Amino acid sequence: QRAGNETPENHPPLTWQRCTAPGNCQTVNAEVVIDANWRWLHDDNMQNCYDGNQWTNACSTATDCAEKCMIEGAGDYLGTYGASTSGDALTLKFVTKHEYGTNVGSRFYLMNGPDKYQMFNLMGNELAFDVDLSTVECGINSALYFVAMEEDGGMASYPSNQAGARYGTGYCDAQCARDLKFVGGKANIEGWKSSTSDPNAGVGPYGSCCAEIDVWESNAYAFAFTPHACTTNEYHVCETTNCGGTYSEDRFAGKCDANGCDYNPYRMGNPDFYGKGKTLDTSRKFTVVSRFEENKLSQYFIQDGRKIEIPPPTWEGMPNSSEITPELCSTMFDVFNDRNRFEEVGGFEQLNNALRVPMVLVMSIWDDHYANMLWLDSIYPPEKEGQPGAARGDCPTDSGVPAEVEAQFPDAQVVWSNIRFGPIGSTYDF
Template sequence: MFPTLALVSLSFLAIAYGQQVGTLTAETHPKLSVSQCTAGGSCTTVQRSVVLDSNWRWLHDVGGSTNCYTGNTWDDSLCPDPTTCAANCALDGADYSGTYGITTSGNALSLKFVTQGPYSTNIGSRVYLLSEDDSTYEMFNLKNQEFTFDVDMSALPCGLNGALYFVEMDKDGGSGRFPTNKAGSKYGTGYCDTQCPHDIKFINGEANVLDWAGSSNDPNAGTGHYGTCCNEMDIWEANSMGAAVTPHVCTVQGQTRCEGTDCGDGDERYDGICDKDGCDFNSWRMGDQTFLGPGKTVDTSSKFTVVTQFITADNTTSGDLSEIRRLYVQNGKVIANSKTQIAGMDAYDSITDDFCNAQKTTFGDTNTFEQMGGLATMGDAFETGMVLVMSIWDDHEAKMLWLDSDYPTDADASAPGVSRGPCPTTSGDPTDVESQSPGATVIFSNIKTGPIGSTFTS
């Protein structure tokens, strides 16, 4: 994700986060079937499930129902310090559909933006794919493989992001490395990404209460002393007006807690341990404003298939990742990715290190992607294993303008790389989006993995 995320939910009686396990609401993971394909194009359906991120869950005292976190403030008596808070507070189960607007049907996952629950109004959500055992995350290595899914984002306006991506989380959510984390992946713990987010309430099995400050523009969010970092592969960040595919890399392997300069906050953005900008391929930003959107070549007013291929240098699963290639399928037609139409750049249609270097030079952007190892580092993260994340969110920090409008807003919109989509720079304010588009929904379905060329029909 481009900005540091402030993902919000008013769950049950209060937004809450924790590491113990509560017993007031049963945790039942929604089932989701996915397909595993072979080189011959034969695909087998397997049963999996999704789990809600711990950041959305009700957090209360162990054995009781007193909130450990209310609004954007910790209870000082229950949470005087990180370790005491972890011992005192429990994450509870989730009412996925009633409270969070998360539903599944066969191979389809639907994420609703605003849900009026019995006790609360929930904003956005984030879920992870669990493995066959229903208690650990499914781990993906996509080197020399392709990943395919269908998406319906016709109901996602400017300012929203229906995202599908991979992050280098621990398979067990960190419970093995950090014994104070009793909830683990079964309750959606252990999140990390290249923005090194500080809004995660528990990191490394401890409450992020040190230096906690409530957000000035979000009554339910705040930031703590620590961030949580890891490699991130953004397969799909999109709304009906624009989309981007973006690898981000780090100098560390696996989920890593950061503090100070290592987090890359503010003016130290390019001094941290992760590449926050990434190397994005956004068709509009790369000069083709006719490719993706309502009524365009890839018509976002109806469902379509997104195919992402991870090519290695020697076409084996052990070779260095050298190219990320994108295809689309809609109405029975395979659609090649758009080509760059930027003065001074070759006509690239995929992500390679050469593309990334040319883009950074042409746009005048800092090239931390190359400095941190580029695509080879992304491939190394896949070898370690990455977790599938699907979410819907709005952006309290940058209004999603980095995805669908002109960004930064104080730059000349005609300068290469500044215009990223057709949305006005006045769009994306969370207050407006939440009040005007509460029914916004993204549907991800028909997820398939397999060797190159096995998951779709050409």
């Protein structure tokens, strides 16, 4: 797709630091840019090509659409999509209300200049950030994470995209981003499945699939640490009944892991750990360092100056420890007694490879039309309840329903700041 001209793109300037030693870091003045989907698409006569949750007759196919339409810059980033930037701190507004419309959710990428993404090496390193999801409630998910995107964002691999990463094109992830309006640079118009309750979203024949390290999924009531691998951690387009995750007829029919190996302290049996007023009090800001090593991923907290470890899981059969090693991803599923997606795509070895795939970092907020975040913060799946890993959060099984959550908690906001990176031991001396 071509780049628009009715509205210049201006990336909000964000700082993060490259460390070598624990208190040996500095100033990298990168930037951020919201995803392609959140962006105006129209031709040269300025009729839309996307309206509501339907492509226009201003278009027609996967290909011609890419020629004749152009995506635009986002105007203001606060009045339109509630994106707030200041120094290191990056803030996101659940529900932005603006004179012309009402946006819910945003998903960004830390950058490297306005033309590329700040790519991260993962294997042998650890991330740090300070988050205050104090006002993030059930049904919401405030997300920080990596996904093996392409640097220039598909502009190169996919010439048709001549707007690329500069305009936050190229998102992929272990579901396969069926809902985006471009994949590989040729549209999803060809039979776009619209959502009955998401007037702006939809689904299209192709996905965009790749490595998805889910450092941060959460709210003020729970959190999960989720690495997911695929049989092609490298960015790739799938095909229709051969796309996975949640936008599809069969979740597990992808070349990737839709669920993966997840560590949620509440799901592993510790309902006293996380929350407002809990041990790891979620009524404010803390730091959450996460750790990537050969067959091991560690996550730890920093709050009120203190080292909070993450408690191990209670259940019989599970290893005596919180880390995400092959060990955990051998028993949790057989106890949680579910389809071991992880295993079938080729276990922790595959995850190893993926931990060498250079990926892009994202911060974001969104509601869950398909399962209203219950997977993250309630009892999921309902079907029964009372079973190991059934309960993930303290949040009622009522919550999530985007409309209700969107209407009642609209000042909802998450703040990402003080992102710190470098080899293990380098970002905090813990």
